[PDB]
PDB file of all heavy atoms in Angstrom:
ATOM      1  N   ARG X 299       2.817  14.103  -4.109  1.00 36.38           N
ATOM      2  CA  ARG X 299       1.657  14.934  -4.407  1.00 36.38           C
ATOM      3  C   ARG X 299       1.487  16.008  -3.337  1.00 36.38           C
ATOM      4  O   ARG X 299       2.426  16.316  -2.602  1.00 36.38           O
ATOM      5  CB  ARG X 299       0.391  14.080  -4.503  1.00 36.38           C
ATOM      6  N   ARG X 300       0.288  16.572  -3.251  1.00 36.65           N
ATOM      7  CA  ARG X 300       0.000  17.609  -2.267  1.00 36.65           C
ATOM      8  C   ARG X 300      -1.223  17.252  -1.429  1.00 36.65           C
ATOM      9  O   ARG X 300      -1.805  16.178  -1.589  1.00 36.65           O
ATOM     10  CB  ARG X 300      -0.212  18.958  -2.955  1.00 36.65           C
ATOM     11  N   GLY X 301      -1.607  18.158  -0.537  1.00 35.62           N
ATOM     12  CA  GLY X 301      -2.763  17.948   0.315  1.00 35.62           C
ATOM     13  C   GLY X 301      -4.052  18.401  -0.340  1.00 35.62           C
ATOM     14  O   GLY X 301      -4.842  19.131   0.259  1.00 35.62           O
ATOM     15  N   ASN X 302      -4.266  17.966  -1.579  1.00 36.92           N
ATOM     16  CA  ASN X 302      -5.470  18.322  -2.322  1.00 36.92           C
ATOM     17  C   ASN X 302      -6.057  17.146  -3.097  1.00 36.92           C
ATOM     18  O   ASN X 302      -6.602  17.319  -4.189  1.00 36.92           O
ATOM     19  CB  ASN X 302      -5.200  19.501  -3.258  1.00 36.92           C
ATOM     20  CG  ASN X 302      -5.162  20.828  -2.527  1.00 36.92           C
ATOM     21  OD1 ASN X 302      -5.808  20.998  -1.494  1.00 36.92           O
ATOM     22  ND2 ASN X 302      -4.407  21.779  -3.065  1.00 36.92           N
ATOM     23  N   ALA X 303      -5.932  15.954  -2.525  1.00 34.70           N
ATOM     24  CA  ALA X 303      -6.560  14.756  -3.070  1.00 34.70           C
ATOM     25  C   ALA X 303      -8.063  14.966  -3.231  1.00 34.70           C
ATOM     26  O   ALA X 303      -8.714  14.283  -4.023  1.00 34.70           O
ATOM     27  CB  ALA X 303      -6.284  13.562  -2.168  1.00 34.70           C
ATOM     28  N   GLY X 304      -8.607  15.915  -2.475  1.00 36.22           N
ATOM     29  CA  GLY X 304     -10.022  16.227  -2.538  1.00 36.22           C
ATOM     30  C   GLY X 304     -10.846  15.391  -1.577  1.00 36.22           C
ATOM     31  O   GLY X 304     -10.306  14.593  -0.811  1.00 36.22           O
ATOM     32  N   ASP X 305     -12.161  15.578  -1.619  1.00 34.10           N
ATOM     33  CA  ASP X 305     -13.067  14.831  -0.754  1.00 34.10           C
ATOM     34  C   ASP X 305     -13.125  13.370  -1.186  1.00 34.10           C
ATOM     35  O   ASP X 305     -13.222  13.070  -2.375  1.00 34.10           O
ATOM     36  CB  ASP X 305     -14.465  15.454  -0.783  1.00 34.10           C
ATOM     37  CG  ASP X 305     -15.325  15.011   0.385  1.00 34.10           C
ATOM     38  OD1 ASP X 305     -14.830  14.237   1.232  1.00 34.10           O
ATOM     39  OD2 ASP X 305     -16.496  15.439   0.457  1.00 34.10           O
ATOM     40  N   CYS X 306     -13.063  12.465  -0.214  1.00 35.20           N
ATOM     41  CA  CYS X 306     -13.068  11.032  -0.497  1.00 35.20           C
ATOM     42  C   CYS X 306     -14.403  10.570  -1.076  1.00 35.20           C
ATOM     43  O   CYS X 306     -14.468   9.554  -1.769  1.00 35.20           O
ATOM     44  CB  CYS X 306     -12.740  10.238   0.769  1.00 35.20           C
ATOM     45  SG  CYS X 306     -13.809  10.609   2.177  1.00 35.20           S
ATOM     46  N   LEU X 307     -15.463  11.317  -0.790  1.00 34.74           N
ATOM     47  CA  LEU X 307     -16.789  10.984  -1.296  1.00 34.74           C
ATOM     48  C   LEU X 307     -16.982  11.484  -2.723  1.00 34.74           C
ATOM     49  O   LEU X 307     -18.077  11.392  -3.278  1.00 34.74           O
ATOM     50  CB  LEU X 307     -17.875  11.565  -0.390  1.00 34.74           C
ATOM     51  CG  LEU X 307     -17.911  11.073   1.057  1.00 34.74           C
ATOM     52  CD1 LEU X 307     -19.092  11.685   1.794  1.00 34.74           C
ATOM     53  CD2 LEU X 307     -17.975   9.556   1.106  1.00 34.74           C
ATOM     54  N   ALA X 308     -15.914  12.017  -3.311  1.00 31.66           N
ATOM     55  CA  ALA X 308     -15.965  12.535  -4.674  1.00 31.66           C
ATOM     56  C   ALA X 308     -16.555  11.508  -5.631  1.00 31.66           C
ATOM     57  O   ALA X 308     -16.135  10.350  -5.652  1.00 31.66           O
ATOM     58  CB  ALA X 308     -14.578  12.956  -5.135  1.00 31.66           C
ATOM     59  N   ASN X 309     -17.535  11.937  -6.418  1.00 31.60           N
ATOM     60  CA  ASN X 309     -18.202  11.053  -7.366  1.00 31.60           C
ATOM     61  C   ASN X 309     -18.232  11.660  -8.765  1.00 31.60           C
ATOM     62  O   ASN X 309     -18.737  12.768  -8.953  1.00 31.60           O
ATOM     63  CB  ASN X 309     -19.622  10.739  -6.887  1.00 31.60           C
ATOM     64  CG  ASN X 309     -20.237   9.557  -7.613  1.00 31.60           C
ATOM     65  OD1 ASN X 309     -19.995   9.345  -8.800  1.00 31.60           O
ATOM     66  ND2 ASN X 309     -21.047   8.782  -6.898  1.00 31.60           N
ATOM     67  N   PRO X 310     -17.689  10.935  -9.755  1.00 26.82           N
ATOM     68  CA  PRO X 310     -17.073   9.612  -9.593  1.00 26.82           C
ATOM     69  C   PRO X 310     -15.752   9.669  -8.833  1.00 26.82           C
ATOM     70  O   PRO X 310     -15.016  10.651  -8.946  1.00 26.82           O
ATOM     71  CB  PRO X 310     -16.821   9.161 -11.038  1.00 26.82           C
ATOM     72  CG  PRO X 310     -17.681  10.043 -11.887  1.00 26.82           C
ATOM     73  CD  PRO X 310     -17.729  11.348 -11.166  1.00 26.82           C
ATOM     74  N   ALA X 311     -15.461   8.622  -8.069  1.00 28.67           N
ATOM     75  CA  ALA X 311     -14.216   8.546  -7.313  1.00 28.67           C
ATOM     76  C   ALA X 311     -13.076   8.049  -8.193  1.00 28.67           C
ATOM     77  O   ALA X 311     -13.121   6.933  -8.712  1.00 28.67           O
ATOM     78  CB  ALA X 311     -14.387   7.643  -6.101  1.00 28.67           C
ATOM     79  N   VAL X 312     -12.056   8.884  -8.359  1.00 29.32           N
ATOM     80  CA  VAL X 312     -10.908   8.532  -9.188  1.00 29.32           C
ATOM     81  C   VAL X 312      -9.677   8.210  -8.343  1.00 29.32           C
ATOM     82  O   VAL X 312      -9.179   9.062  -7.606  1.00 29.32           O
ATOM     83  CB  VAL X 312     -10.571   9.650 -10.197  1.00 29.32           C
ATOM     84  CG1 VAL X 312     -10.481  10.999  -9.494  1.00 29.32           C
ATOM     85  CG2 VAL X 312      -9.275   9.330 -10.930  1.00 29.32           C
ATOM     86  N   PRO X 313      -9.192   6.965  -8.444  1.00 28.13           N
ATOM     87  CA  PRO X 313      -8.006   6.504  -7.716  1.00 28.13           C
ATOM     88  C   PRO X 313      -6.728   7.081  -8.310  1.00 28.13           C
ATOM     89  O   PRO X 313      -6.519   6.979  -9.519  1.00 28.13           O
ATOM     90  CB  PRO X 313      -8.031   4.983  -7.929  1.00 28.13           C
ATOM     91  CG  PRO X 313      -9.406   4.667  -8.441  1.00 28.13           C
ATOM     92  CD  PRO X 313      -9.825   5.877  -9.204  1.00 28.13           C
ATOM     93  N   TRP X 314      -5.886   7.679  -7.472  1.00 25.42           N
ATOM     94  CA  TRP X 314      -4.619   8.228  -7.939  1.00 25.42           C
ATOM     95  C   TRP X 314      -3.617   7.112  -8.227  1.00 25.42           C
ATOM     96  O   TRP X 314      -3.275   6.326  -7.344  1.00 25.42           O
ATOM     97  CB  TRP X 314      -4.054   9.239  -6.934  1.00 25.42           C
ATOM     98  CG  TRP X 314      -3.733   8.663  -5.589  1.00 25.42           C
ATOM     99  CD1 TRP X 314      -4.546   7.891  -4.810  1.00 25.42           C
ATOM    100  CD2 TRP X 314      -2.517   8.836  -4.851  1.00 25.42           C
ATOM    101  NE1 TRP X 314      -3.905   7.561  -3.640  1.00 25.42           N
ATOM    102  CE2 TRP X 314      -2.659   8.130  -3.640  1.00 25.42           C
ATOM    103  CE3 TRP X 314      -1.319   9.515  -5.100  1.00 25.42           C
ATOM    104  CZ2 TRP X 314      -1.649   8.082  -2.679  1.00 25.42           C
ATOM    105  CZ3 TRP X 314      -0.318   9.466  -4.145  1.00 25.42           C
ATOM    106  CH2 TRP X 314      -0.489   8.755  -2.950  1.00 25.42           C
ATOM    107  N   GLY X 315      -3.158   7.049  -9.474  1.00 27.47           N
ATOM    108  CA  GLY X 315      -2.301   5.971  -9.935  1.00 27.47           C
ATOM    109  C   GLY X 315      -1.050   5.742  -9.110  1.00 27.47           C
ATOM    110  O   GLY X 315      -0.494   4.644  -9.109  1.00 27.47           O
ATOM    111  N   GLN X 316      -0.602   6.778  -8.408  1.00 26.47           N
ATOM    112  CA  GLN X 316       0.606   6.679  -7.594  1.00 26.47           C
ATOM    113  C   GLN X 316       0.429   5.698  -6.437  1.00 26.47           C
ATOM    114  O   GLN X 316       1.406   5.263  -5.826  1.00 26.47           O
ATOM    115  CB  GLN X 316       1.011   8.057  -7.066  1.00 26.47           C
ATOM    116  N   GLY X 317      -0.820   5.349  -6.142  1.00 23.58           N
ATOM    117  CA  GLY X 317      -1.120   4.433  -5.058  1.00 23.58           C
ATOM    118  C   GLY X 317      -0.792   2.992  -5.397  1.00 23.58           C
ATOM    119  O   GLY X 317      -0.425   2.207  -4.523  1.00 23.58           O
ATOM    120  N   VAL X 318      -0.927   2.645  -6.673  1.00 22.26           N
ATOM    121  CA  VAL X 318      -0.647   1.289  -7.133  1.00 22.26           C
ATOM    122  C   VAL X 318       0.809   0.914  -6.874  1.00 22.26           C
ATOM    123  O   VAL X 318       1.120  -0.241  -6.581  1.00 22.26           O
ATOM    124  CB  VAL X 318      -0.952   1.129  -8.635  1.00 22.26           C
ATOM    125  CG1 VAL X 318      -0.676  -0.298  -9.085  1.00 22.26           C
ATOM    126  CG2 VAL X 318      -2.394   1.519  -8.929  1.00 22.26           C
ATOM    127  N   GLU X 319       1.696   1.898  -6.982  1.00 19.16           N
ATOM    128  CA  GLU X 319       3.122   1.672  -6.770  1.00 19.16           C
ATOM    129  C   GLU X 319       3.456   1.554  -5.287  1.00 19.16           C
ATOM    130  O   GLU X 319       4.331   0.780  -4.899  1.00 19.16           O
ATOM    131  CB  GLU X 319       3.942   2.794  -7.409  1.00 19.16           C
ATOM    132  CG  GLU X 319       3.898   2.809  -8.930  1.00 19.16           C
ATOM    133  CD  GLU X 319       4.604   1.614  -9.547  1.00 19.16           C
ATOM    134  OE1 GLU X 319       5.380   0.946  -8.831  1.00 19.16           O
ATOM    135  OE2 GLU X 319       4.383   1.344 -10.747  1.00 19.16           O
ATOM    136  N   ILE X 320       2.757   2.325  -4.462  1.00 21.39           N
ATOM    137  CA  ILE X 320       2.969   2.290  -3.020  1.00 21.39           C
ATOM    138  C   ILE X 320       2.614   0.919  -2.457  1.00 21.39           C
ATOM    139  O   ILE X 320       3.214   0.459  -1.485  1.00 21.39           O
ATOM    140  CB  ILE X 320       2.142   3.372  -2.302  1.00 21.39           C
ATOM    141  CG1 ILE X 320       2.447   4.752  -2.888  1.00 21.39           C
ATOM    142  CG2 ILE X 320       2.426   3.357  -0.809  1.00 21.39           C
ATOM    143  CD1 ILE X 320       1.690   5.878  -2.222  1.00 21.39           C
ATOM    144  N   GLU X 321       1.635   0.267  -3.078  1.00 19.80           N
ATOM    145  CA  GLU X 321       1.230  -1.073  -2.672  1.00 19.80           C
ATOM    146  C   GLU X 321       2.296  -2.097  -3.042  1.00 19.80           C
ATOM    147  O   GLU X 321       2.697  -2.918  -2.217  1.00 19.80           O
ATOM    148  CB  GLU X 321      -0.100  -1.450  -3.326  1.00 19.80           C
ATOM    149  CG  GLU X 321      -0.561  -2.864  -3.014  1.00 19.80           C
ATOM    150  CD  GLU X 321      -1.767  -3.278  -3.834  1.00 19.80           C
ATOM    151  OE1 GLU X 321      -2.102  -2.563  -4.803  1.00 19.80           O
ATOM    152  OE2 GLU X 321      -2.379  -4.318  -3.511  1.00 19.80           O
ATOM    153  N   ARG X 322       2.753  -2.040  -4.289  1.00 20.54           N
ATOM    154  CA  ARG X 322       3.770  -2.964  -4.780  1.00 20.54           C
ATOM    155  C   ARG X 322       5.083  -2.793  -4.025  1.00 20.54           C
ATOM    156  O   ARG X 322       5.972  -3.641  -4.106  1.00 20.54           O
ATOM    157  CB  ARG X 322       3.995  -2.762  -6.280  1.00 20.54           C
ATOM    158  N   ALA X 323       5.199  -1.691  -3.292  1.00 19.76           N
ATOM    159  CA  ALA X 323       6.392  -1.417  -2.500  1.00 19.76           C
ATOM    160  C   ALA X 323       6.312  -2.110  -1.146  1.00 19.76           C
ATOM    161  O   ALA X 323       7.195  -2.884  -0.779  1.00 19.76           O
ATOM    162  CB  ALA X 323       6.567   0.078  -2.315  1.00 19.76           C
ATOM    163  N   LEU X 324       5.246  -1.821  -0.408  1.00 14.41           N
ATOM    164  CA  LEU X 324       5.034  -2.409   0.909  1.00 14.41           C
ATOM    165  C   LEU X 324       4.983  -3.930   0.836  1.00 14.41           C
ATOM    166  O   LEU X 324       5.569  -4.621   1.670  1.00 14.41           O
ATOM    167  CB  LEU X 324       3.741  -1.872   1.524  1.00 14.41           C
ATOM    168  CG  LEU X 324       3.732  -0.395   1.925  1.00 14.41           C
ATOM    169  CD1 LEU X 324       2.308   0.133   2.010  1.00 14.41           C
ATOM    170  CD2 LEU X 324       4.465  -0.192   3.240  1.00 14.41           C
ATOM    171  N   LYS X 325       4.280  -4.445  -0.167  1.00 14.37           N
ATOM    172  CA  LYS X 325       4.118  -5.885  -0.333  1.00 14.37           C
ATOM    173  C   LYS X 325       5.419  -6.561  -0.759  1.00 14.37           C
ATOM    174  O   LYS X 325       5.574  -7.773  -0.614  1.00 14.37           O
ATOM    175  CB  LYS X 325       3.013  -6.185  -1.348  1.00 14.37           C
ATOM    176  N   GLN X 326       6.352  -5.773  -1.283  1.00 12.54           N
ATOM    177  CA  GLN X 326       7.633  -6.304  -1.738  1.00 12.54           C
ATOM    178  C   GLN X 326       8.676  -6.276  -0.624  1.00 12.54           C
ATOM    179  O   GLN X 326       9.729  -6.904  -0.730  1.00 12.54           O
ATOM    180  CB  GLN X 326       8.139  -5.516  -2.949  1.00 12.54           C
ATOM    181  N   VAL X 327       8.372  -5.543   0.443  1.00 10.25           N
ATOM    182  CA  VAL X 327       9.283  -5.413   1.574  1.00 10.25           C
ATOM    183  C   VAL X 327       9.575  -6.765   2.213  1.00 10.25           C
ATOM    184  O   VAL X 327       8.702  -7.630   2.283  1.00 10.25           O
ATOM    185  CB  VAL X 327       8.711  -4.466   2.649  1.00 10.25           C
ATOM    186  CG1 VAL X 327       9.626  -4.421   3.864  1.00 10.25           C
ATOM    187  CG2 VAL X 327       8.514  -3.074   2.074  1.00 10.25           C
ATOM    188  N   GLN X 328      10.809  -6.941   2.675  1.00  8.77           N
ATOM    189  CA  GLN X 328      11.199  -8.162   3.369  1.00  8.77           C
ATOM    190  C   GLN X 328      12.390  -7.915   4.290  1.00  8.77           C
ATOM    191  O   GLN X 328      13.545  -7.998   3.868  1.00  8.77           O
ATOM    192  CB  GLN X 328      11.520  -9.276   2.371  1.00  8.77           C
ATOM    193  CG  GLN X 328      11.828 -10.614   3.021  1.00  8.77           C
ATOM    194  CD  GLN X 328      12.012 -11.728   2.009  1.00  8.77           C
ATOM    195  OE1 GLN X 328      11.738 -11.556   0.822  1.00  8.77           O
ATOM    196  NE2 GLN X 328      12.479 -12.880   2.476  1.00  8.77           N
ATOM    197  N   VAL X 329      12.098  -7.611   5.549  1.00  7.51           N
ATOM    198  CA  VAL X 329      13.135  -7.352   6.539  1.00  7.51           C
ATOM    199  C   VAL X 329      12.956  -8.237   7.766  1.00  7.51           C
ATOM    200  O   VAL X 329      12.027  -9.042   7.833  1.00  7.51           O
ATOM    201  CB  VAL X 329      13.136  -5.877   6.980  1.00  7.51           C
ATOM    202  CG1 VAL X 329      13.575  -4.982   5.833  1.00  7.51           C
ATOM    203  CG2 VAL X 329      11.756  -5.475   7.484  1.00  7.51           C
ATOM    204  N   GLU X 330      13.851  -8.085   8.736  1.00  6.92           N
ATOM    205  CA  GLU X 330      13.786  -8.865   9.964  1.00  6.92           C
ATOM    206  C   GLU X 330      13.317  -7.990  11.121  1.00  6.92           C
ATOM    207  O   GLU X 330      13.889  -6.932  11.381  1.00  6.92           O
ATOM    208  CB  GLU X 330      15.155  -9.470  10.283  1.00  6.92           C
ATOM    209  CG  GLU X 330      15.102 -10.660  11.226  1.00  6.92           C
ATOM    210  CD  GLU X 330      14.544 -11.903  10.562  1.00  6.92           C
ATOM    211  OE1 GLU X 330      14.357 -11.884   9.327  1.00  6.92           O
ATOM    212  OE2 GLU X 330      14.294 -12.898  11.274  1.00  6.92           O
ATOM    213  N   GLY X 331      12.273  -8.436  11.814  1.00  6.34           N
ATOM    214  CA  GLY X 331      11.713  -7.673  12.914  1.00  6.34           C
ATOM    215  C   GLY X 331      11.513  -8.494  14.173  1.00  6.34           C
ATOM    216  O   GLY X 331      11.993  -9.623  14.274  1.00  6.34           O
ATOM    217  N   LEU X 332      10.800  -7.921  15.137  1.00  2.00           N
ATOM    218  CA  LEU X 332      10.534  -8.595  16.402  1.00  2.00           C
ATOM    219  C   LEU X 332       9.699  -9.855  16.200  1.00  2.00           C
ATOM    220  O   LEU X 332       9.834 -10.827  16.945  1.00  2.00           O
ATOM    221  CB  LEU X 332       9.820  -7.650  17.371  1.00  2.00           C
ATOM    222  CG  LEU X 332      10.548  -6.355  17.733  1.00  2.00           C
ATOM    223  CD1 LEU X 332       9.683  -5.492  18.637  1.00  2.00           C
ATOM    224  CD2 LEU X 332      11.884  -6.658  18.393  1.00  2.00           C
ATOM    225  N   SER X 333       8.838  -9.832  15.188  1.00  2.74           N
ATOM    226  CA  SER X 333       7.959 -10.961  14.902  1.00  2.74           C
ATOM    227  C   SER X 333       8.549 -11.874  13.832  1.00  2.74           C
ATOM    228  O   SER X 333       7.842 -12.332  12.934  1.00  2.74           O
ATOM    229  CB  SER X 333       6.576 -10.468  14.471  1.00  2.74           C
ATOM    230  OG  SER X 333       6.666  -9.622  13.339  1.00  2.74           O
ATOM    231  N   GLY X 334       9.849 -12.137  13.934  1.00  4.20           N
ATOM    232  CA  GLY X 334      10.525 -13.026  13.008  1.00  4.20           C
ATOM    233  C   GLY X 334      10.633 -12.458  11.607  1.00  4.20           C
ATOM    234  O   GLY X 334      10.498 -11.251  11.405  1.00  4.20           O
ATOM    235  N   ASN X 335      10.880 -13.332  10.636  1.00  3.41           N
ATOM    236  CA  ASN X 335      11.019 -12.916   9.246  1.00  3.41           C
ATOM    237  C   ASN X 335       9.716 -12.359   8.682  1.00  3.41           C
ATOM    238  O   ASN X 335       8.684 -13.029   8.702  1.00  3.41           O
ATOM    239  CB  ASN X 335      11.508 -14.080   8.383  1.00  3.41           C
ATOM    240  CG  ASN X 335      11.791 -13.665   6.953  1.00  3.41           C
ATOM    241  OD1 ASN X 335      12.020 -12.489   6.671  1.00  3.41           O
ATOM    242  ND2 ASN X 335      11.779 -14.630   6.042  1.00  3.41           N
ATOM    243  N   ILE X 336       9.771 -11.132   8.177  1.00  2.46           N
ATOM    244  CA  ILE X 336       8.589 -10.476   7.633  1.00  2.46           C
ATOM    245  C   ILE X 336       8.554 -10.533   6.108  1.00  2.46           C
ATOM    246  O   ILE X 336       9.429  -9.988   5.436  1.00  2.46           O
ATOM    247  CB  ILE X 336       8.507  -9.006   8.081  1.00  2.46           C
ATOM    248  CG1 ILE X 336       8.584  -8.910   9.605  1.00  2.46           C
ATOM    249  CG2 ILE X 336       7.230  -8.364   7.568  1.00  2.46           C
ATOM    250  CD1 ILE X 336       8.510  -7.494  10.131  1.00  2.46           C
ATOM    251  N   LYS X 337       7.537 -11.197   5.571  1.00  4.82           N
ATOM    252  CA  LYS X 337       7.348 -11.286   4.128  1.00  4.82           C
ATOM    253  C   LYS X 337       5.863 -11.242   3.791  1.00  4.82           C
ATOM    254  O   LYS X 337       5.023 -11.574   4.625  1.00  4.82           O
ATOM    255  CB  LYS X 337       7.978 -12.568   3.579  1.00  4.82           C
ATOM    256  N   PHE X 338       5.541 -10.835   2.568  1.00  4.22           N
ATOM    257  CA  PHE X 338       4.148 -10.698   2.160  1.00  4.22           C
ATOM    258  C   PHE X 338       3.884 -11.332   0.800  1.00  4.22           C
ATOM    259  O   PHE X 338       4.807 -11.569   0.021  1.00  4.22           O
ATOM    260  CB  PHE X 338       3.747  -9.223   2.118  1.00  4.22           C
ATOM    261  CG  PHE X 338       4.041  -8.479   3.385  1.00  4.22           C
ATOM    262  CD1 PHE X 338       5.281  -7.900   3.592  1.00  4.22           C
ATOM    263  CD2 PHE X 338       3.076  -8.355   4.368  1.00  4.22           C
ATOM    264  CE1 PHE X 338       5.553  -7.215   4.757  1.00  4.22           C
ATOM    265  CE2 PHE X 338       3.344  -7.670   5.536  1.00  4.22           C
ATOM    266  CZ  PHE X 338       4.584  -7.099   5.730  1.00  4.22           C
ATOM    267  N   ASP X 339       2.613 -11.603   0.523  1.00  4.43           N
ATOM    268  CA  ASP X 339       2.199 -12.079  -0.789  1.00  4.43           C
ATOM    269  C   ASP X 339       1.512 -10.955  -1.552  1.00  4.43           C
ATOM    270  O   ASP X 339       1.499  -9.809  -1.102  1.00  4.43           O
ATOM    271  CB  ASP X 339       1.274 -13.294  -0.663  1.00  4.43           C
ATOM    272  CG  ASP X 339       0.060 -13.018   0.203  1.00  4.43           C
ATOM    273  OD1 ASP X 339      -0.115 -11.859   0.639  1.00  4.43           O
ATOM    274  OD2 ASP X 339      -0.722 -13.963   0.448  1.00  4.43           O
ATOM    275  N   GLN X 340       0.938 -11.280  -2.705  1.00  3.34           N
ATOM    276  CA  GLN X 340       0.310 -10.273  -3.553  1.00  3.34           C
ATOM    277  C   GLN X 340      -0.886  -9.609  -2.876  1.00  3.34           C
ATOM    278  O   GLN X 340      -1.292  -8.510  -3.256  1.00  3.34           O
ATOM    279  CB  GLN X 340      -0.117 -10.887  -4.886  1.00  3.34           C
ATOM    280  N   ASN X 341      -1.446 -10.275  -1.871  1.00  2.35           N
ATOM    281  CA  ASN X 341      -2.626  -9.763  -1.182  1.00  2.35           C
ATOM    282  C   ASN X 341      -2.290  -8.880   0.015  1.00  2.35           C
ATOM    283  O   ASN X 341      -2.859  -7.801   0.179  1.00  2.35           O
ATOM    284  CB  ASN X 341      -3.533 -10.916  -0.748  1.00  2.35           C
ATOM    285  CG  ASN X 341      -4.082 -11.695  -1.925  1.00  2.35           C
ATOM    286  OD1 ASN X 341      -4.056 -11.226  -3.062  1.00  2.35           O
ATOM    287  ND2 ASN X 341      -4.584 -12.895  -1.656  1.00  2.35           N
ATOM    288  N   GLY X 342      -1.366  -9.343   0.849  1.00  5.47           N
ATOM    289  CA  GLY X 342      -0.964  -8.593   2.025  1.00  5.47           C
ATOM    290  C   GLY X 342      -0.794  -9.474   3.246  1.00  5.47           C
ATOM    291  O   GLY X 342      -0.261  -9.040   4.267  1.00  5.47           O
ATOM    292  N   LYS X 343      -1.256 -10.716   3.142  1.00  5.87           N
ATOM    293  CA  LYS X 343      -1.110 -11.674   4.230  1.00  5.87           C
ATOM    294  C   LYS X 343       0.345 -12.108   4.361  1.00  5.87           C
ATOM    295  O   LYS X 343       1.007 -12.395   3.364  1.00  5.87           O
ATOM    296  CB  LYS X 343      -2.006 -12.891   3.994  1.00  5.87           C
ATOM    297  N   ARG X 344       0.842 -12.149   5.593  1.00  6.76           N
ATOM    298  CA  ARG X 344       2.231 -12.521   5.841  1.00  6.76           C
ATOM    299  C   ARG X 344       2.508 -13.975   5.482  1.00  6.76           C
ATOM    300  O   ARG X 344       1.649 -14.842   5.646  1.00  6.76           O
ATOM    301  CB  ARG X 344       2.611 -12.257   7.299  1.00  6.76           C
ATOM    302  CG  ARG X 344       2.735 -10.786   7.649  1.00  6.76           C
ATOM    303  CD  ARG X 344       3.379 -10.602   9.011  1.00  6.76           C
ATOM    304  NE  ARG X 344       4.697 -11.225   9.078  1.00  6.76           N
ATOM    305  CZ  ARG X 344       5.472 -11.212  10.157  1.00  6.76           C
ATOM    306  NH1 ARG X 344       5.061 -10.606  11.262  1.00  6.76           N
ATOM    307  NH2 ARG X 344       6.658 -11.805  10.131  1.00  6.76           N
TER     308      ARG X 344
END
């Protein structure tokens, strides 16, 4: 997208659908780091 998401206080506030995918991406990540094996659940807790 671009730098025109608009004011966050926008009412009604409309969530950009592209965000739902960004979440399912981070939460699906599973690599090896300094803090041992990194994995997540549907919520975000390791």
